[PDB]
């Protein structure tokens, strides 16, 4: 007949049950090639140890039931059909500590050889063990483990849509000028089993991010050297005046309230606190010198 | 959000397309022209924004107008949480340029294509139904069409909207310059104290402390160099050399 592609959509989806895994031979596993693009690091929580990022995610798999021949269908190659009208893999991330609000993509592309192309952006709230040892200049290494939460490796298996080097070097469509700088996203496949006879497919993504030591530069070193040179000015006061003692005390108070204010910036030892308590002790021995003379 | 670099706005959005299946002749239907039918009962394009980093809560419109020539009219308000690279270089008087790229997240340009319902100048100059008296002033919303492709054989249609907004340098005026000139003239009063008194030193120290805690408090307003900090650290250094003068004499 001649309703065109409307026939196709019917022909495929007439008796198509979206509950059963799309394989003619049930022994044949469905392989899902996935792709991850880092769009932005939204927020790092050092205290609660949790990373929040935004990812552009790609899912590719084969639906053996949605296959057809391009001919007698007016040479149609691919067809757009509703996501929730077809079988979809349950791949999730283990590091998930919450659920990020992400736009729902209603359509997917299914091609005549049964290739299903699923695009969707995800907001990932994933737990990550952070090490803030070198606070201003620290690198962070966070894992994103994509795996089917139920299906074994003989049912659902995960691969990479494109080369792992492409995935690694991909810094395109990513927002800089932020607190963090994306270094690389390193993909690695692993077969995880907690026992014999049951093995699952893992696809890890190591997102590595480096901090930008500029916002924390001025807010840290500038006031310290400021009160330092103010103290230096304070030495010029003659010991006889008596106002010199009040000088050192008031300055010590100011640096104290300063270190109490800057105490609420990043939790931990931060190690940079040592290079700070040095200044603290310097003002202390300065005061001790003043009261001595 | 200057820190996280993300803009949250509210938009009135209009979608117009042609449904070739929903066409009919006005006659033998009692001369009906258009018909209101449920949105989720008909095919709808998947046009979204690339800058989306979240999902804004927006009222759901249940109905659309479908006309006898198959024209589908879809109205809906959207809350847009979109990421935008901000430049706070000139902090009090800064202009911001944020992109809103409307495109089908799946369909190619041979399936879904995006155009402008009305003239781009109308879209640009449209400042109607916009709320002023806020922190930001809307300058223009400049639409531009582009064909984006990451490869051959697959091209997608992009419709960018550059929203340009200018800050209102009034709330950040008083909160910045007033205490500085205040403590400045207080310091000027402080010079009138004779060096012999000795209270002049405590004067300069207490004033310096007050300006210090002031600059620490005002340090938490807008993150960055903010450039306006230089025109501030000037005052800081001025009070410093004032103190140095006092202890000198």
């Amino acid at each position, epitope marked *: 007949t001649q309703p065109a592609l409307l026939r196709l959509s019917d022909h495929l989806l007439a008796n198509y049950k979206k509950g059963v895994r799309p394989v003619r031979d049930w022994r044949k596993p469905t392989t899902v090639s996935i792709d991850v693009i880092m769009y932005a690091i939204l927020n790092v929580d050092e205290k609660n140890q949790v990373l929040t990022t935004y990812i552009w995610y790609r899912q*590719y798999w084969t639906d053996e039931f949605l296959q057809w021949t391009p001919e007698d269908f007016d040479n149609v*190659t*691919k067809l757009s059909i509703p996501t929730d009208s077809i079988w979809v893999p349950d791949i999730l991330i283990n590091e998930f500590v919450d659920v990020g609000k992400s736009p729902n993509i209603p359509y997917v592309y299914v091609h005549h050889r049964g290739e299903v192309q699923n695009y969707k952006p995800l907001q990932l709230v994933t737990a990550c063990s952070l090490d803030i040892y070198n606070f201003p200049f620290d690198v962070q290494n966070c894992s994103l483990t994509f795996t089917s939460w139920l299906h074994t490796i003989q049912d659902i298996n995960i691969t990479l849509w494109r080369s792992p080097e492409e995935v690694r070097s991909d810094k395109s469509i990513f927002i800089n000028q932020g607190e963090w700088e994306l270094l690389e996203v390193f993909p690695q496949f692993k077969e995880f089993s907690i026992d014999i006879s049951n093995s699952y497919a893992e696809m890890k993504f190591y997102v590595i991010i480096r901090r930008r030591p500029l916002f924390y530069a001025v807010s840290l070193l500038l006031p310290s050297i400021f009160l330092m040179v103010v103290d230096i000015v304070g030495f010029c006061l003659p010991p006889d005046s008596g106002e010199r003692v009040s000088f050192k005390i008031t300055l010590l108070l100011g640096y104290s309230v300063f270190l109490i204010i800057v105490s609420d910036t990043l939790p931990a030892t931060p190690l940079i606190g040592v290079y700070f308590v040095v200044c603290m002790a310097l003002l202390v021995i300065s005061l001790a010198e003043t009261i001595f003379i | 959000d200057e820190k996280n670099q993300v803009l949250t706005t509210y938009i009135w959005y209009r979608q117009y397309w042609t449904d070739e299946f929903l066409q009919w002749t006005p006659e033998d239907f009692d001369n009906v022209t258009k018909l209101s039918i449920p949105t989720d009962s008909i095919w709808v394009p998947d046009i979204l924004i690339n800058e989306f980093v979240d999902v804004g809560k927006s009222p759901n419109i249940p109905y659309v107008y479908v006309h006898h020539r198959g024209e589908v009219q879809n109205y809906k308000p959207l809350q847009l949480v979109t990421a935008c690279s901000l430049d706070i270089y000139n902090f009090p008087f800064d202009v911001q340029n944020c992109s809103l790229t409307f495109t089908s997240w799946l369909h190619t340009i041979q399936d879904i294509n995006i155009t402008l319902w009305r003239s781009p100048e109308e879209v640009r100059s449209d400042k109607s139904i916009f709320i002023n008296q806020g922190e930001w002033e809307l300058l223009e919303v400049f639409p531009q069409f582009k064909e*984006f*492709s990451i490869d*051959i054989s697959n091209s997608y249609a992009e419709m960018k909207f550059y929203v340009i907004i200018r800050r209102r340098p009034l709330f950040y005026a008083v909160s910045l310059l007033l205490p500085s000139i205040f403590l400045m003239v207080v310091d000027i009063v402080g010079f009138c104290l004779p060096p012999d008194s000795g209270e002049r030193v405590s004067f300069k120290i207490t004033l310096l402390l007050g300006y210090s805690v002031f600059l620490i408090i005002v340090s938490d307003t807008l993150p960055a160099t903010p450039l306006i900090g230089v025109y501030f650290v000037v005052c800081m250094a001025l009070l410093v050399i004032s103190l140095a003068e006092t202890i000198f004499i």
Partner: nanobody
Amino acid sequence: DVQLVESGGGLVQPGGSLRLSCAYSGSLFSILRMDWYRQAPGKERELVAGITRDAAGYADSTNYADSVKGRFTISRDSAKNTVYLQMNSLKPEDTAVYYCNADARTITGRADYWGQGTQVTV
């Protein structure tokens, strides 16, 4: 997976023009790069022209050999699913068998694909 078909090859007198077409087809594929190659009898495979989208994801970027630098112009039409090679002022050295090489990514993976090629005799 993806099939390429060359066409337009023939016999032309020196200084003439000829436009070659290479049609790609398949199910799920992404042509990242499309190169034109020519092979004279006995001589090696020679790179003529190539095309790939620029760093900016809008306008394309062509790549020509020093030989055909000014004479040849490579183009493409995604809508007709065909990549073109416009050969102007053909010299007798341009005489060869012209294939087209497509670096495409499918569900199987990233790979190079070749057509049957067409004969161009000047």
